[PDB]
Paper text:
Clamp loaders are pentameric ATPases that place circular sliding clamps onto DNA, where they function in DNA replication and genome integrity. Because the sliding clamp is a closed ring in solution, it needs to be opened and placed onto DNA by a separate ATPase complex called the clamp loader. All clamp loaders are pentameric ATPases of the AAA + family (ATPases associated with various cellular activities). Here we describe a series of structures of the E. coli clamp loader in the process of placing the clamp onto a p/t-junction.
A surprising class of DNA-primed particles exhibits an open clamp structure, but the collar region is in a different conformation from all other γ-complex structures reported herein or elsewhere. The movement of the collar opens a large pore between the A and B subunits. Moreover, this movement alters the center of the collar at the binding site for the ψ protein, an accessory factor that, together with the χ protein, acts as an adaptor linking the clamp loader to the single-stranded binding protein (SSB). The Altered-Collar state shifts the binding site such that it is incompatible with the known binding pose of the ψ protein. We attribute this structure to an off- or parallel-pathway intermediate and discuss potential implications for the Altered-Collar conformational changes in the Discussion. The Altered-Collar state observed here severely disrupts the ψ protein binding site, suggesting that this conformation is incompatible with ψ protein binding. Because the E. coli clamp loader can readily load ß-clamp onto nicked DNA, we speculate that this pore could function as a channel for the unwound primer strand of nicked DNA to exit the central chamber, similar to RFC.
Residue numbers in the entry:
A (entry chain A): 1 to 343
B (entry chain E): -2 to 334
C (entry chain G): 119 to 366
D (entry chain D): -2 to 363
E (entry chain C): -2 to 370
F (entry chain B): 124 to 360
Amino acid sequence: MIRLYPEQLRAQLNEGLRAAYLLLGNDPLLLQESQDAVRQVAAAQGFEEHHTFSIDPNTDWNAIFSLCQAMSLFASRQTLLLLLPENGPNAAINEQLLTLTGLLHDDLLLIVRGNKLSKAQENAAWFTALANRSVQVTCQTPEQAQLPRWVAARAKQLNLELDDAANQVLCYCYEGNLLALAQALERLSLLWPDGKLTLPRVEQAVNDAAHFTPFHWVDALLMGKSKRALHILQQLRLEGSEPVILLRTLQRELLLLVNLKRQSAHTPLRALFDKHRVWQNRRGMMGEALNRLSQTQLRQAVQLLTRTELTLKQDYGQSVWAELEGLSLLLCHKPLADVFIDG
Amino acid sequence: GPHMRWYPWLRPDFEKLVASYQAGRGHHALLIQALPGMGDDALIYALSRYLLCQQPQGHKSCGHCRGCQLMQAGTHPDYYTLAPEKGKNTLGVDAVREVTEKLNEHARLGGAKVVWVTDAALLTDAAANALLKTLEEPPAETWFFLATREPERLLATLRSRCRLHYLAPPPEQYAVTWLSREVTMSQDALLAALRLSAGSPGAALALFQGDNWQARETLCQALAYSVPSGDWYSLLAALNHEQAPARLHWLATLLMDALKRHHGAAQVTNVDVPGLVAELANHLSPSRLQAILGDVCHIREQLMSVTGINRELLITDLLLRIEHYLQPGVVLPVPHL
Amino acid sequence: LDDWQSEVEFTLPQATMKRLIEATQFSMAHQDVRYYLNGMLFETEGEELRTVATDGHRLAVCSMPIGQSLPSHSVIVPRKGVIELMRMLDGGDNPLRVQIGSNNIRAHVGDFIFTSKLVDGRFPDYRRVLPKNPDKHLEAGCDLLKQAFARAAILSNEKFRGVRLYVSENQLKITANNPEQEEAEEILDVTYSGAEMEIGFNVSYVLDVLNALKCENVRMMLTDSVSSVQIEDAASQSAAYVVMPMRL
Amino acid sequence: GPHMSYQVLARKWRPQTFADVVGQEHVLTALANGLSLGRIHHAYLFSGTRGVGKTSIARLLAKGLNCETGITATPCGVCDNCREIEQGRFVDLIEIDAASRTKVEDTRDLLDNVQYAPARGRFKVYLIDEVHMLSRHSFNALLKTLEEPPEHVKFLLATTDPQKLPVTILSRCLQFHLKALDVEQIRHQLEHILNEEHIAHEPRALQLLARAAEGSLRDALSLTDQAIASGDGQVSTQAVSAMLGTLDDDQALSLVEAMVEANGERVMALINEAAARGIEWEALLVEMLGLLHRIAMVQLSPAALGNDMAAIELRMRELARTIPPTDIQLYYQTLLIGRKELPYAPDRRMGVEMTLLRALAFHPRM
Amino acid sequence: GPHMSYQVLARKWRPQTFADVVGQEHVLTALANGLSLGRIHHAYLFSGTRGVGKTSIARLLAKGLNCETGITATPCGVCDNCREIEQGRFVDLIEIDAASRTKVEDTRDLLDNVQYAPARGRFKVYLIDEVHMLSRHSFNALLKTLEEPPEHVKFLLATTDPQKLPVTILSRCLQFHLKALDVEQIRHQLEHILNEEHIAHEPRALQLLARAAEGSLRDALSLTDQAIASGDGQVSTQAVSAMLGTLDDDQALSLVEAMVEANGERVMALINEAAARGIEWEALLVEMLGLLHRIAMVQLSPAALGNDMAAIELRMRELARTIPPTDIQLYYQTLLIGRKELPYAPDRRMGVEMTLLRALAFHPRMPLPEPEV
Amino acid sequence: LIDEVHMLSRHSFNALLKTLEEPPEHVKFLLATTDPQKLPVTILSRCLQFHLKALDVEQIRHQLEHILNEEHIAHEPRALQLLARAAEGSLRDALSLTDQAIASGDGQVSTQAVSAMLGTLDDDQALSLVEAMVEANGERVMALINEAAARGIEWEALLVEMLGLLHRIAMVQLSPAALGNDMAAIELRMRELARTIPPTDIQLYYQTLLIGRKELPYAPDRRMGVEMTLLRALAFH
DNA sequence: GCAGACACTACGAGTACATA
DNA sequence: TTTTTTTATGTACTCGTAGTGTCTGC
Ligand SMILES: Nc1ncnc2c1ncn2[C@@H]1O[C@H](COP(=O)(O)OP(=O)(O)O)[C@@H](O)[C@H]1O
Ligand SMILES: Nc1ncnc2c1ncn2[C@@H]1O[C@H](COP(=O)(O)OP(=O)(O)O)[C@@H](O)[C@H]1O
Ligand code: BEF
Ligand code: BEF
Ligand SMILES: [Mg+2]
Ligand SMILES: [Mg+2]
Ligand SMILES: [Zn+2]
Ligand SMILES: [Zn+2]
């Protein structure tokens, strides 16, 4: 219930165990390595038998068998590692968890692992009853701007030297995909145990395998950088989200931006953003975005976008995903189109 | 009785159709053409209660046979209604195939069978095409029933084998008298709403009873604001809604009344609001007015044609198109070939 | 549900209906385009209650005399109703009262009456399907033929369980192939005399027929390779089966 | 409970003999030559617009293939096999509601039992109707059976359009294109049917029903059955004219001349009057296109008007004299485009008003 | 003898020796050279449009491989194995109708049975026809076997759209594309078929059939059978022309020349003649568009005319020389708009009449004169 | 070695995970795939993934040279560059194509068998027609249309690529470096028509091609339609 | 016998994918 | 820090479950 960060969960792990542990937060790899650290700490301590249970609706609780009966040949305590569903559990499972805690033995440990829960799921009967002694901890992957420091810190922990150019190429190639980042770090360490990597082969042992959620796409398109936007779209290949999500995203911000430009003659852009708290990390990134445009520019953007909107859904076009390449690139160096398209 | 209340103008046709079903020479596929809400479904239900009544008399069901209490109870194994699934606006081919395969057996009750399709136009092309070879060569004592706004929209093959029974909306004087008997406010707005509904009194009644009337008032006020200034963008606040194509239809109706006023036609659809049509005629050139009209109609048909499209985007792009057309020295759309 | 007219009453032990259905159930259509092909045809004659089942390529007709005057009436009952009716048969001592209607089939067993909806169609004329000339006729031991056919079929083609009879003077030769070529040959001593002949046909169907009748000595009748085979028991003529050949 | 249930004309008068079929001379001659000469084929697909007779031709061919007389060009009609096919009992004619039975599962099921010999007939005809709604897997499943079927099985395909089929299947059958039936054939067939059915009919009413069917026996015959309900026992000219919404009056050319002279008020008044009277709009624009065609044709070559055109020549030749040749084609294109967009308009009258205003926008000076 | 059985031209005339093929060079030569040099690759996919020979070429190659004597490029037609594959249902050729075998539950069984040695001949030939119909799991299952099959297994994969296959399957096996045939080859094949059939034929009808076959030999053979049925057992230009709906009657060059010469009366006369002939109007418009297109192509380069069109070449050249390109483009656009508006015309004859009239009156060098003012 | 792991069922992956979390020390086991995105994140995170790169053209060319030299087959270099280019990067693909080349060339991979392959590996076609549209090059247009007809690619897609090239050219006219990354191999010829040609001519060509695409399906044949589009484009300037 | 094994086969669901 | 928002129809595959044939030392 404490709702702390794993940098402190390590501290509570070093001290006396605070009964059941619940580590949450959507994690690429940090959840698994935190689980591994918990496993090794427990193995050093009493609890050694890690029984893996997948918490899911429509799946009966075989954990009661461990809960009601104690181990007989090697007790050695034991730990129940629970895997939560990606949407959270239901009331039946939440109350059966409380029943299990009622069946808890002194050598039993409860570990609940999952993603962020809903408020009712968070404040269920089991969590409420365990709020007296259990702990809660959450973590999330670093952002784009927070990546270089994290990568450098991990490199310094692993006793391998990095460089600014190497960090740049890593944060470009592996942006938010820490599993790939960790594998690349291990590969660069094992390839050359010299301990000096500046830019000799870091690209040779690093591919383009990273996640890219749509919110950053306009962040490039608002500068109108042709090569950068084209490279971002090429990076989006092989993890290709269906076009509808990207289309919804850019229609959202373009409707917001056209409303902003309509109201620009009225109350200034900052106090207008006061209504448009879309948390674009300052609401000022949109402020520098709106600096480079024109009303005719917005017309040329919206015509192509709305033509695509019927180009993929009215007749089910197959090039429409590649059309996202077409629409984003043409806006980069189009101050205003002299009609000739006006879709 | 019938779900929708009986409408007086539907009495004659009923008798006529009953005649065609008394001699046994009914066409077994009576595609009703009626304006939506006018009472096509009421006629279908009355007719089907007659037909599935295994003990009828004259031209009205007995209402005493326990078949009739099954009818009024809403459950019957010889009465197959095909409606869109709740939350989805189309009836699939799976439902049609299930109905056809269940219709294969005899009548459960020792009588006739009726398959009634709630709305013909909503049929998917696969679903509609799977309804062939079942109303063309139907089993013995099998009757179909279909309702539509406009038969030409249907698949050509399906319409080919169905008796197209028309229903005429009542003469405008009778319709306005009935509306005034039921609806309360001014006759001018009453007539305007009736005209907007293609002449169907039921849809005018629905527009008045629902919130659509206050929405139309807000939209017309916004139009009055926007037309002299050219700030059509504000109209978005009244257009983007679940019922957006209807309000786009209202806008197109205003535009056409403006064009007619420019041509000087005596009778206009939006007669209840002379100020708006006068302002539209004064401030907008007919050459650009027809362009606004064409884009409004095109976007309306795109909204009502393709399922699950982002109405907000298309409406705003329309509004920006009028913004461009207001600006002078711009090429105007020409209806392409 | 209300009562029906054209309702002839039956009085027969459940064993009779069980024997009948078990005789003509394995050859009843299952999810076929011919909609009337599903279910069994129950036809009333002054002699028996004949029943007819067919897939278009297995025609099984059973005829158990009932000992009552029956007005001529032909009915088709769907697969579901037939299966349920067979499930409701047991004991063999209670008299089953079968009540036919225009659109329904009812049946009184013990103290309960159950009903089934009735398929709307016109079933084919089975008598014309039955061959019009039994010029080539042979008799052979039922269990011997069944064992030989099982032996041959264990190497038969999986999807198309197809074997080939070669009938010579007092001899039946069963030959079976399959993908991953394997040849099964088996010779039976039979009571045959006539023209030498070969005919390919499904073996699962014939094994099913022999399982259904299971007499002491079967006899089959046939003319030409394309001609269908009519198999019955040599003791009586109450049950007949028609199997349509493979190849052509 | 009438005779089965086909008290309707659409089912009662489907032909039972190659002699009884109307039109389709080329395909009937080809099928008869193939049957008699011995050149037979395992897969015919009949492609043509709706209500032309591809299903009927297919069933009649199935009769002719399995008549006890032999492979006869004209089916017996009285022999047992023809009677069974008429009843539908015939266990070798496997009709398929391919629009309903679409799953590849059922196609595979019906292909597994192709090796069996026919129960009674010579040929096991796989009549498939509405082939174009087979799922792509079903189309490709039919391939190796369509190409080289056993000696005894023959396929018949009856599709509304041929181009939706994969080019593989389209290249393995005889494509018989059923030529759409012209007005005279429809009129003669309808008159013969009505004389057989003993109901009085007027020739011009039959002409209307023929010209409104756009070449379809099923469509025209359904329209006649509709008129019988309206016109009591007889297909009378007045009743069918009112039902079909024909333009009996001369207001068509009147609003034509109003439209070409940019008389917006007159055009709107005529439209209002027509809507009050209860006109049909698609026929209005069809008449517009016809009148414009006649005007243009006599503008090029005089003395081209006939009957009613030759009577209203006093106006038509004046219009051809006053209207330049270039503007006639533009008016015609605008009117036909409006007719194209009539379905894509919430109100038919509003769609016609839109079309007329688009036409008047060519010369919107006043 | 002539063996009067009248059983489908397509199936009767499937190639049986390596030389009866219609004239695919780039694949027949490669296969023959591979079989001669001993390089018998264990898996290869034939692609190409419908009815070119890929399913036939696979059967010929299986014949060649499993011949009784040593591997020969040209199979014999006398040995037991070649006779058996000739008659079908051959012992060692497993022809898998993959469109009927798409479930992984059967491809797994196939790969289970692949190990057992064949009984006759040298190889067991898995001719998997319509490969592109296999379900994804079946393809992945086939992958490892295709990479390293046993010594005595060859996979004959044939399909119509190889792009549907997973790219790894394309990598595992060779790729032979069978080009759609030329008009000369297909016409020669039709001549051979009809001559051996002892059926009289006319050269124009054969050229028509070749043109309408769209470069796929089975289309031409099916059309030849349909024409044999259409005529009284003989292939005639009249029968083929009436059955195909082509406009060889009164050509179409007269109509286009009346267009460019702006003679409305000649256009009307030709239209009335066609109407009495009962021709379909959209085909006439398509013919006019094709004539305009060929005229433009010849105006760019005189060698654009086809040899099948060598009947009216002088007038074609003259029209190419006279009419400026812009007028040709205007005619093409007007007639194309007319064809687009044909379904919406009040009548097809009337619509085509007005399309002809519009393309006439807008002719710049000779427009329709304004009547009075 | 569990080859092609991406086809394991979900429960199969669960069994694999339960084996991986507590693996016996005396055992190990490799694993392979082609589409790693289908594996669960748990097993991917656990496994020490190596990513194997697509071969470069030079690598494949030299390996094929070595292979051909190894057994007995003579070879000329241009055939090998063509094979490497058509291999699209997979070495097994290069070996299959060299088997086909040996077959067609009768035990000799000369330029003629791979020239027969050239009908398949010839790719650059949409840019040459755009470059030849702005003038009358004579036989260039005829050769290109012959190639397009004998190749049978989507004419609608061909004209859409034409339109995209022309639109980015118009974009470059109003911006000296509008894309830059467009056709890096043709950054020395496409630029000339990107700037020399007047923007009015570019707009007129765009109008012509748009009109052609709009009316393309209604032509007697789509090849005829694209021919007519080319002729209309060549009719003006 | 024989019920329980034991196999085997069919059906629904949840999921992944394709194509129009 | 919680934020918008495409379908119908079809085809496979794999996992439970459920129902049923068949038959083995019990
Ligand atoms: N060629 C024809 N000769 C006679 N009647 C015809 C013909 N074509 C159509 N009909 C009439 O149309 C009805 C339906 O015909 P049908 O063959 O089902 O057309 P479709 O090709 O569209 O399935 C028939 O019952 C018959 O009355
Ligand atoms: N190269 C060819 N030579 C001779 N006949 C051919 C050829 N290609 C196709 N055919 C004709 O087409 C019929 C079927 O050809 P088929 O090989 O099945 O084409 P597919 O490649 O589409 O399966 C053959 O019976 C033959 O008459
Ligand atoms: F085209 Be028909 F009505 F089958
Ligand atoms: F007819 Be082929 F196999 F496409
Ligand atoms: Mg039909
Ligand atoms: Mg084939
Ligand atoms: Zn009643
Ligand atoms: Zn040989």
